[PDB]
Design an enzyme around this catalytic site. Structure first.
Site, mmCIF file in Angstrom:
data_model
loop_
_atom_site.group_PDB
_atom_site.id
_atom_site.type_symbol
_atom_site.label_atom_id
_atom_site.label_comp_id
_atom_site.label_asym_id
_atom_site.label_seq_id
_atom_site.Cartn_x
_atom_site.Cartn_y
_atom_site.Cartn_z
ATOM 1 N N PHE A 1 0.867 -1.251 0.039
ATOM 2 C CA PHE A 1 -0.006 -0.012 -0.085
ATOM 3 C C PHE A 1 0.744 1.058 0.123
ATOM 4 O O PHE A 1 0.345 2.378 -0.126
ATOM 5 C CB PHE A 1 -1.006 0.165 1.146
ATOM 6 C CG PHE A 1 -1.970 -1.157 1.183
ATOM 7 C CD1 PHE A 1 -3.015 -0.910 0.324
ATOM 8 C CD2 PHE A 1 -2.250 -2.102 2.014
ATOM 9 C CE1 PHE A 1 -4.135 -2.046 0.309
ATOM 10 C CE2 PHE A 1 -3.011 -3.123 2.068
ATOM 11 C CZ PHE A 1 -4.110 -3.050 1.158
ATOM 12 N N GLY A 2 2.028 1.159 0.002
ATOM 13 C CA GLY A 2 2.927 2.298 -0.012
ATOM 14 C C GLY A 2 4.449 2.209 0.494
ATOM 15 O O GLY A 2 4.865 0.918 0.590
ATOM 16 N N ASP B 1 -0.625 -16.990 8.148
ATOM 17 C CA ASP B 1 0.625 -16.727 7.391
ATOM 18 C C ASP B 1 1.814 -16.710 8.576
ATOM 19 O O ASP B 1 2.830 -16.025 8.318
ATOM 20 C CB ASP B 1 0.583 -15.474 6.878
ATOM 21 C CG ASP B 1 1.859 -15.490 5.936
ATOM 22 O OD1 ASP B 1 2.578 -16.196 5.582
ATOM 23 O OD2 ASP B 1 2.089 -14.106 5.023
ATOM 24 N N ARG C 1 9.759 -15.331 8.340
ATOM 25 C CA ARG C 1 9.732 -14.098 7.423
ATOM 26 C C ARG C 1 8.497 -12.807 8.086
ATOM 27 O O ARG C 1 8.899 -11.713 7.938
ATOM 28 C CB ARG C 1 9.589 -14.226 6.085
ATOM 29 C CG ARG C 1 8.035 -14.862 5.959
ATOM 30 C CD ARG C 1 7.558 -14.620 4.305
ATOM 31 N NE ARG C 1 6.356 -15.464 4.282
ATOM 32 C CZ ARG C 1 6.125 -16.600 4.421
ATOM 33 N NH1 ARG C 1 7.171 -17.494 4.412
ATOM 34 N NH2 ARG C 1 5.155 -17.133 4.371
ATOM 35 N N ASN C 2 7.796 -13.367 8.841
ATOM 36 C CA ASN C 2 6.620 -12.645 9.772
ATOM 37 C C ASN C 2 6.910 -12.419 11.129
ATOM 38 O O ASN C 2 6.252 -12.173 11.864
ATOM 39 C CB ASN C 2 5.165 -13.233 9.503
ATOM 40 C CG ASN C 2 4.531 -12.920 8.192
ATOM 41 O OD1 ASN C 2 4.875 -11.633 7.675
ATOM 42 N ND2 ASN C 2 3.749 -13.569 7.596
ATOM 43 N N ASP D 1 2.688 -9.022 10.910
ATOM 44 C CA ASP D 1 1.998 -9.531 9.491
ATOM 45 C C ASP D 1 2.192 -8.041 8.982
ATOM 46 O O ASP D 1 2.725 -7.302 9.054
ATOM 47 C CB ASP D 1 0.695 -9.961 9.696
ATOM 48 C CG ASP D 1 0.276 -10.714 8.597
ATOM 49 O OD1 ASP D 1 0.840 -10.580 7.360
ATOM 50 O OD2 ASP D 1 -0.924 -11.624 8.989
#
Length: 260
Positions: A9-10, A121, A125-126, A139
């Site tokens: 989202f940015g 998830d 990596r999270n 997340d």
């Protein structure tokens, strides 16, 4: 109250927060010309995040929606994602420290699960790491693109329980399967679960009772607990409270971590 230093989202910047003492923070800005849908989803992820409060769940410091651009402020984690952090530091931690990292992650997952939240998830990596090696579940933030981490359907095959792949049966018990994989990542210092098996081979292999082997020098206790997390019968997998309990048992009895 916010400032930005060294910059889905940015953007993804490093910033400084000052509340009525000053701290480093993580800032998600929202790019120019965001859609109503890009704005609605960006913030509701903050909403999800800000209902939690636990030392192994990433803190939402806050959010500023009263000005353009609109930001999500979260806690700063100096050592970044656990999987790269473990790769950069291969072999550098004791078995007790690794169990410690896992214990913290298991504790965050027990909190989420008592909150009736299914992560979906859960993966190294999270998991974010601060300068004191504290691991926090995160997340909303690629070895071989031919076997990508995510498959669209949104599903990270190598981390996802077979009933969540096959039937979309996502539950805390499917998160427990994912935790098992996370255990294997930590203990192996960031190897790719299932290596050069294709994504399809992994589904096939798993349905055939293949389970990942012990990482090098991994204590048999810890691998046993992975195997428990990867029981095909979802009802038999331990709950996160049980995992926390088993890990504490091992910390109280470290001689037992010597068997390999």
């Amino acid at each position: 109250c916010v400032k930005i230093e060294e910059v889905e989202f940015g953007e993804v910047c490093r910033g400084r927060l000052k509340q009525p003492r000053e701290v480093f923070v993580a800032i998600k800005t929202l790019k120019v010309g965001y859609t109503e849908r890009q704005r609605r989803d960006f913030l509701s992820e903050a909403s999800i995040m800000g209902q939690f409060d636990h030392p192994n769940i990433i803190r939402l410091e806050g959010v500023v929606t009263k000005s353009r651009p609109v930001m999500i402020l979260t806690e700063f984690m100096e050592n970044c994602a656990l999987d790269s952090f473990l790769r950069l530091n291969d072999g550098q931690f004791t078995v007790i420290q690794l169990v410690g990292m896992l214990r913290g992650i298991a504790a965050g997952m027990k909190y989420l699960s008592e909150m009736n939240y299914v992560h979906r998830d859960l993966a190294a990596r999270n998991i974010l790491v601060n300068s004191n090696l504290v691991c926090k579940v995160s997340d909303f933030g690629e070895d071989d693109p031919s076997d990508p981490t995510y498959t669209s359907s949104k599903i990270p095959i190598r981390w996802t329980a077979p009933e969540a792949i096959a039937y979309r049966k996502f539950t805390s018990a499917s998160d427990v399967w994912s935790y098992g994989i996370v255990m294997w990542e930590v203990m192996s210092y960031g190897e790719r679960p299932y290596w050069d098996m294709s994504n399809q081979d992994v589904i096939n292999a798993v349905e055939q009772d293949y389970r990942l082997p012990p990482p090098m020098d991994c204590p048999t206790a810890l691998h046993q607990l992975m195997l428990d997390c990867w029981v095909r019968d979802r009802n038999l997998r331990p709950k996160f409270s049980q995992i926390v309990n088993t890990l504490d048992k091992l910390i109280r009895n470290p001689a037992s971590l010597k068997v390999i």
